[PDB]
Symmetry: C2
Subunit: 61 residues, 2 copies
């Protein structure tokens, strides 16, 4: 029902995030955030150790 | 002179760049950008080799 960027399927990070990462050099959050707010395959897989601003602002960790 | 945040007053980065660290808890960039625009005191001290995240967004390098 409700699961916009929820848990369990957050391991799908190695797909959407992997492709979004290649859109900004590789391994970024402030810049990659633009394509990070799409679908439900993010969460505490990417912005886990990266919980400073941009992504943490939307609460993904 | 006409040089806001130019390559000279780069040494003054110890105030805005080192200050933004304590402002957002730690050092990085995603959230450090906020207190980075403190008039100036930025220059080639930030965004140099760190021109990946918001550092390129707020063109400095």
């Amino acid at each position: 029902a409700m699961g916009k960027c929820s848990v369990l399927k957050k391991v799908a990070c190695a797909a959407a995030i992997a492709g979004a990462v290649a859109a900004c050099g590789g391994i970024d959050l402030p810049c990659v955030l633009a394509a990070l707010k799409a679908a439900e395959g993010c969460a505490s897989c990417f912005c886990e150790d990266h919980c400073h601003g941009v992504c943490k602002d939307l609460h993904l960790c």
